């Protein structure tokens, strides 16, 4: 369980972000136990941030292995009366946390939070907090790294100077303490550890079913307040499970959010949770939000800004939401990893719909004998399923109460058209459906493949989410051919009668390149590419959404097809609109959020 | 007045209140209707810390005139009330009124320096609302100065504006809001440290730290000095308020080779740790001496300016900017044209970057017929009183920084006109009185036809010149620029005191090129700098070069501003122009010490 740390009448919240000490591992940092003493001959590194782009050093940017972060932690002794917790919102990719040279916890997985109590007996007058951070990726990590020194994106072979991470995905491997580190407290004896809300609409009355997980013995009380502060439901001494009702409930709607304040108390412990009331259901070829047929308009994003890389950037989060409202979007996907809680909470407050995605990109070993992706671990297949289950558990545990989250994406462009794929994914879908109290739709995001009718998403998903590049990776500069090949395939998907959508489609576009005559990489070609795709999708009644690749240009590994990163953004990396951004502002201004295809 | 940087200690809580706050533009009725007494209704959400102007896509927000209201909930543990509870605002631009529940706690004027207020415990209810009203208006009484007609500082045909707008008397965009973090911190109620003053004495081959510890209440004082590894190298218990400690084996703080001791102070239960670099600064003859060695400034005037936060604290960019300056071979910058965040100052102490620390005094000029320094009752500028408070507050905040080597009293005031000396004499006197280290003081000189009457000559320890030979004069005639540059700078050189460029540059749009001198091109920017250097490299009293600017930055709109000021060596997103590589090469051949 992972409630978002907040300041309450019972909970201290102390942010440890700022300038920390930082040192690259030279192969001896664990042997010489650097975590037992002040880091020596070190740099300084801002926290939170990815550390790859902060300096000017290729050796820093392309480091392979561990680094050590460290700061002093001199906390008031008064807090020893409370329970003291160190919360790491995200550390990419794996972490070992030491206080005063004692290992307190380890974590695997770069994009979900973890915490540990500091034992009171470990706290001195002055303390050292050391975080060791591993950036290595392989066939057992999510995201998947290649183990063969080849590039996912050479014409003549060469021996690399140093060993480097080789991503099996198309985005730069930004690592470090990506999101805030905070110290918080709760009472020692009795405290709230999790909160689970679900809702049901009976005419204009909402029934909110709650389960409040707690530690210790005390009495649980829950209260529901309007934005303006009026109590509208209250029940006392309810224990763990229970329900309550709101008369004339204001529903949470895309672009028209409404959040109630849910105040929980358990003994001395107090926690407030914002909560929007809304329903999600797939019915026929319809994606129903509040029982109305939704049409997705938006993007796959990345958490990517300069110079922090993947690091939390709160002004840019507000800027990006403001740009999506300017453009007329209503939704995005968290490609390809869970985003910060601060973004998710802002989406709840601003009314932006989210497809929440796990970290499972690169689950594909065929993107001295040939190997199948989903062969036995013994026979060389991918080793990600056990961690994949943990990521699903933790993602839903973190984000289950968000009104903005309407669909879970189990993986991006895994090898779903090969043998064994169904056997790998069926337990993960079953896991997602078992653990989400709201029972939201589940999808996997489908790689473009020649044997698309063989994609196991057909057996598993509530919505078929397709990544397709008709006019870019195929039919490049032949948009007539693109239109015919797009129609041939999408008519197949449309004939299945279930809702389907684009979760990626686009064309690399360098701002400032132009031509009136179709030419790839120009601003005009981006627009023509999209016009050609919309000629097809606009005629298909099961096509219920368009999310472009990408919201904005972002950093990737180096390669002959990556023009200083991925250039498929509608916006540049500094959020400036290309021609196609204005095209979509016009297009989305004429398409309603509901009832476009009714 | 005393403004210790808030830190987490054994006796002090530190609660950061940054995040998403509610935000509402005032419509003229915000105070009349007492908006601060309830939740803001029909409000937006705004990140804190940040400037608010560029977060949305609204021109009316960006160009808003007057007040806005920020607000958040503040539900804190009651056991905090056993401590002294303090609300610290690191910066609110330009003026603030702070309310807790219905109650006005404080009001502040000056948009770039911290202020704080105790929260009386009788006011803290179970649930609390914190409201901050922020005024963005500028006039002849604010620093920085706003114009009080419809004039733009940057028009061919006259027109009536749709709405009233601030008219800056300065070349940067009027970014406003809760610029820097808002934090809640605590100290012991009954005995606590209010200020710490440290100075260094290097005479007789013996390095000593002199301390003076300001307290409230009655208790015993102790001070210890610790190396970076944590070895105690001097300590004394039950000490007086003032005293000295000898540091054997002292390592000096040097430009690009920082060393910071940790100075831990105890007073009763209170504990405060202050990083401290030991170094000397002095002007002797025509030399700027750091640790008794002749320094040559290499660097920039900067701005706090990033997209989309505007003036807002951006700590990843701070670290990126220092990395770029070390990559380029710079050793210094000036806080143009306002105090920067404490986070930047502290990072500069850590990284060995030398800082010229400047007040908010830009626009002190009414004639870019009433003269600037006429009597206030005849229309003269009305800033002198606030100018003293800013100097007091700036020195109180930054006095212990080793990186700060020089105070800049104003940028481009009307210092060649009648009355300037009398306006500035008390301010120089004040800065010298208040700085325990007695660092050099200057004002940054506007380019001016009667430069021999610049009152900087009568006041300043270092003459700091803003000159644009080859841009605002002699544009595209660099041979004439060289001659005009040499004529004036030989005058300055003949005075025998240290002098330097604090600004020089040429607007340069990345991607515009020409092998033949053409303004706005990347090549012209290089040639502009080559021409100036042809002259400055021959003048033995010229002890420093700070370009205008480190990076492109936002300004008001006008016919000569190409989406802001384009004189950066880097772009707004920190990419090097041709001239940035030119300077990396040049500054790699110029030593920090002993160039001239
Ligand atoms: O996708 C990859 O990996 C490779 C791709 N291409 C493509 C043709 C670009 C390679 C080409 C190779 N030839 C290399 C040099 N030729 C000269 O070079 C100029 C240029 O290419 O700039 C042309 O303009 C000149 O006309 C021509 O004389 C071109 C072709 C090659 F050896 C390897 C690759 C790859 O490995
Ligand atoms: O349209 C024109 O003809 C002129 C226009 N302007 C104004 C800026 C519109 C002039 C301004 C002059 N001063 C104004 C600012 N001083 C420093 O210059 C930087 C910069 O301007 O780049 C600013 O950013 C720094 O903050 C500031 O310290 C330089 C001297 C001048 F001498 C001549 C002109 C013109 O001639």
Numbering used by the authors:
A (entry chain B): 17 to 169, 172 to 385, 394 to 624
B (entry chain A): 16 to 169, 172 to 385, 396 to 623
The authors write:
Here, we define the 53 unique GUSs in the human oral microbiome and examine diverse GUS orthologs from periodontitis-associated pathogens. To examine the structure and function of unique GUS enzymes from the oral microbiome, we recombinantly expressed and purified the following proteins from bacteria strongly associated with periodontitis: L2 and mL1 proteins from Tannerella forsythia (TfGUS L2 and TfGUS mL1) and an L1 from Treponema lecithinolyticum (TlGUS L1). Although the core glycoside hydrolase family 2 (GH2) fold is conserved among all GUS enzymes of known structure, two loops positioned adjacent to the active site influence substrate binding and catalytic activity. The presence or absence of these loops and their lengths have led to the classification of microbial GUS enzymes into several categories : loop 1 (L1), mini-L1 (mL1), loop 2 (L2), mini-loop 2 (mL2), and no loop (NL).
L1 microbial GUS enzymes have been shown to be potently inhibited by small molecules that uniquely intercept the catalytic cycle to form a distinct inhibitor-glucuronide conjugate. We further determined the 1.95-Å-resolution crystal structure of TlGUS L1 in the presence of PNPG and ciprofloxacin, an antibiotic that is effective in the treatment of periodontitis and is known to be highly concentrated in the GCF. PNPG is a GUS substrate and initiates the catalytic cycle of the enzyme, which UNC4917 then intercepts. Thus, oral microbiome–encoded L1 GUS enzymes are subject to unique and selective inhibition by piperazine-containing drugs, such as ciprofloxacin and the synthetic inhibitor UNC4917.
